[PDB]
Design a binder for this molecule. Structure first.
Ligand code: ANU
Ligand code: ANU
Ligand code: ANU
Ligand code: K
Ligand code: K
Ligand code: K
Lengths: 248, 240, 243, 241, 240, 242
């Protein structure tokens, strides 16, 4: 039984859930669900692993998106079909501002659209903006947890390498568009790079769905040295769960 | 006399002000200022009328932007040069959603960039996004006075006519880009049209400046002013 | 009682006028109208100050546009609704060519579209070109009073600062698009920057309206009252030929 | 030869600084024959060049072939040889109902529906004709008494889909061009041709003077009109020497 | 225990492998590997499941890409870092031509770039073109195995839904860019939709890596709404 | 005439469904002369056309002139007349250091630095050659043992700035093309010419088969401008596609 093409889920599986937490990694799904009550694995197909748990007595979904806008768009669309109206992405990220430290938490108000999938939902002029209630819940939850928090703009790239201006690659070249791009984003106050939010935020904001994004800073592109990255993971994970409580 | 090319203001005129309320219309400037302590006229040059006031013992600027991104970009830049770090735009607006009514208050989280000036600060991929603290202050101020408030996306157009898909014009034509565009924005949940936010929000978000926007709905495309005005002043109070 | 949303004007106020002189600054409107017969103030709303005057017995309008394409597009549209078919922009301007000196007069044949409002009327492919009759009248008017005239392309920018590649700013930053752009326009023979012509010329050329532009060189970044009056006489003299 | 395509040297031009540039190589001699001392210089590919004399001054007539790409080659190489003024004389399909077959169209600027113009200036730059050239063409058309329209021309890299012709092998027009002719008509565009956007953009952005005149061969809504526009371009050339 | 960030693989793990077969689905990796000599599981991290096998005495990698250009670009880059120089994608696909049947095999010569990741390697002007030797090996392999084969252009979309003009979605809205797009690709002779080839082909063709693309038709859109695997393995034999 | 520019009727083709399309009008006769019963058909503007016979089948040779625009006219009108397969035979500037003058380059697909291709398909559509045509060209090349390279070609609307030549009147290259040759080179692009982007796009998007082959006349790593192997190959490839 499945109501959707990819996820292998039915509306019954959701038990009336209307909020989903959407990490990138299928392996993080169980870990996030473990922060809630009565978590049960629902399905695992391709990069889409899903669990249901209870939060303050209400059903909540945790479902992985895989890496990138394309797989993210599938998860979000199919979750929406199933009844999800609110999406919270939780990630781990590399900061590009020297003042943003490993262990810090980043809440994304909106994203630089360095992706392709967002364009499948809205023209480039449209902002990849987070829902206000979601952003509020994340900011507030970060205060409840105790994190050092930065709130602002994230660059959301379709690649891990040239789109984030990495030169440590097979070709060692970066196409003209992205040459000198990291310095530009830095100067514009962009906090970090990741790979899913442009798609998530655009597709939700343009379709009457609520979306927020929080991430833990595990590395800094400007710093030479590369605590536990699982400690920063757990901080961000606790925040997304606490935020979800306020959006139910 | 002036530390800036257009505004006719010095840093001294601001008296340490770091926040400016920025209406479009010079006429609205004094009225906004009058809701605060010790309001005084500063200068008037072209579409840039500026007043100073005080909230909770802190200096606040009110300065008009004129219509559109170009004049807004001038005002925001020169205010930034003089020490303004937080900008709160206040406008009146026409809603494009069936369930956004006249007398409603709109708080803009981000704008569709249907302008040219925003591109002079950041490429199109960059979001014309409002500052979270500003958006928070505006939403909370709106709730504190019991206004019917909608929070979300605004379409910000370089024109009043074709860019907002108006056909009641000299030519009666709308360029291909904008034909059917209102229905598209509507389907995407865009609240309203105005003409300055894409520029304001992009230029601030990409230059380490805080910006927010609130507007009063006075008409639907499918008393009010003084309520939006009360909201922007109360929001400013929370951001000093 | 107004027929249009912003200008506060009726068709009757124009008294059959079909040409408008469109300066940027409301404060310059009377000064221009004062060079013609029977100058009367019509209205003043926002940046749109309008006067009516009379030239060779025909009614003419002088109306300010404010700064930038957006406000210009409002003034032009609403003036067209009221019957205006010919628009003559007058400005004062800097220059980006070293051979162009303060005192010189610039007549614009077409503009580099560094604005956004022009795109609301025609796709970028469409030329921001001046009307031939208006340009002819302006060039001939400049010759009649013996002004040193440069005829060519103007870069029309939605910003005063980064789009004209100014670095003396709060951020000191210019976006990639405009980094090295002034040198590029200079090498392409562009005369100057201003902020309204791309919108004016495109919206008129694509809607059967006639537009032209003249400007006095007051400053040169590469390198004012006398130049002002020169440009104003030219635009008024050109208007006579176009009535 | 001093140049790669045209097969010409600086001396072949004998001090010439103006070139009349038709599209068709076969039209070159005809135009040259209207002036004094017409002499064939060279013929390579679509580039046939003649020299002639106008009021004692050497003038070049050189074909461009069809399209911006070959036009850009001819213009560049002539510029290398010393040409500073270029006058295009062409054939055109009018798209305005009031413009009759046989009429003369003087182009102030072009809608850039080409690719070559972008190799000289970004799309924001106007494909605008030189004022002196345009003035000379208009004044020449008046002296000949020709029915003349002055304005904007759509300049297309294709004869078929870019001019929204459906009478084709596929009968398909790509989205960009579907409904485009009506759009250009509403915007007051006079006509279609295939070289002006490149010519005007490359000249205006490089300090070269260019003008564009054409005779109407079809209305998108016979023998005498060619010579009519040809007479105009030669008369205009006289005013630009 | 890993020379690359995401795959969890070391250069040692590859055993001299220079060719990788790259399916979308992690769960298909073992199946493909099983068709060859000495299949050994290497790693499984995120959507990246990798096996090593042997084909005519030579080491060959099978590694999943996950869905979409972004995850594909990571797999290809890190596999290239470990020494892979030839990539053969084996996928599933929806045909958009009436004459192409379910169960048919499609060899892609080049792709319509309806993706974003390809632009991170080459501007849009650059063709998302397959390697000639890889395409030849696939066509030749198809003759060998015996399948109804179509060779041509593929539309490669960053989405499963709006980019493939699907309307049975939550919003039922397809953005302007993609309204009527399927009929357009159909008239242009495009065979099919999938989601990875534009990224794969562009990133390889612009980086001196060889890439080929083959897929089995699982649905025909003009109605709704193992051959291919044998062919990719046989093609790999011809390319070692 | 059945078509506006070429001056040809379907009868002139004698059932030909394949055309060999050089850029230069003066090359048409030379190509035709390598086949049986060569007959001149017409010469209008840059479009010179001949008919010939290959293995008892009629073949057209027709010049395109330089550039996408005139190419698009020739291909379209030939298509109207019944041509379904087009083989471009051109000259080219190599941008890779180890490609020799005289080498034969077979194009798999083109970088669309042209304008005409966009009149047939949006930029995301690949300017890709037909597989059968490309195969025939490669296999003809090995049959005569010519030094051959197969891969991507940059196809430009200009000879000068779009191919980043600086020895020009202005000596300037617009921002878009500054540093472009190094970029294409790094991307493994073999060569520059001016027609293939248009040809390949317009054919691949309209159910017409196209192949592209060119002889190297200059190596751009060394010089901008120079101080019948490819022709044999295109004729031999044509035999295989009849
Ligand atoms: O609709 C038309 C009519 C005439 N011309 C045209 N388009 O382009 C010009 C060409 O060079 C050429 C192509 O036929 O002739 C010009
Ligand atoms: O219409 C289709 C049919 C199959 N596939 C597709 N689009 O994209 C490929 C994906 O990786 C994936 C997504 O379902 O499967 C492939
Ligand atoms: O650098 C080059 C060398 C040869 N060719 C070229 N560029 O474009 C092709 C043209 O049609 C024409 C222009 O010279 O010949 C081809
Ligand atoms: K994925
Ligand atoms: K203004
Ligand atoms: K040509």
């Amino acid at each position: 039984k499945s109501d959707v093409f990819h996820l292998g889920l039915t509306k019954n599986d959701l038990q009336g859930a209307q909020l989903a937490i959407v990490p990138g990694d299928p392996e993080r799904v169980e870990k996030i669900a473990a922060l809630m009550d009565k978590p049960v694995k629902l399905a695992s197909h391709r990069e889409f692993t899903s669990w249901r748990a209870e939060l303050d007595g209400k059903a909540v979904i945790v479902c992985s998106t895989g890496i990138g806008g394309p797989s993210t768009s599938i998860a979000v669309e199919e979750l929406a079909q199933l009844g999800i109206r609110t999406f919270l992405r939780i990630g781990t990220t590399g900061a590009i501002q020297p003042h943003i430290n490993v262990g810090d938490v980043l809440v994304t108000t909106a994203s630089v659209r360095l992706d392709g999938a967002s364009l499948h939902f809205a023209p480039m002029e449209f902002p990849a903006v987070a829902d206000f209630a979601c952003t509020t819940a994340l900011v507030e939850a970060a205060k409840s947890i105790g994190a050092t928090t930065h709130v602002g703009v994230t660059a959301s790239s379709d690649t891990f390498y040239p789109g984030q201006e990495r030169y440590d690659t097979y070709s060692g070249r970066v196409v003209r568009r992205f040459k000198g791009s990291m310095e530009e984003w830095q100067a514009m106050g962009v906090m970090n790079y990741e790979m899913e939010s442009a798609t998530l935020l655009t597709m939700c904001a343009s379709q009457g769905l609520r979306a927020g994004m929080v991430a833990g800073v595990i590395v800094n592109r400007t710093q030479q040295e590369i605590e536990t990255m699982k400690q920063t993971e757990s901080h961000a994970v606790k925040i997304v769960v606490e935020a979800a409580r306020r959006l139910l």
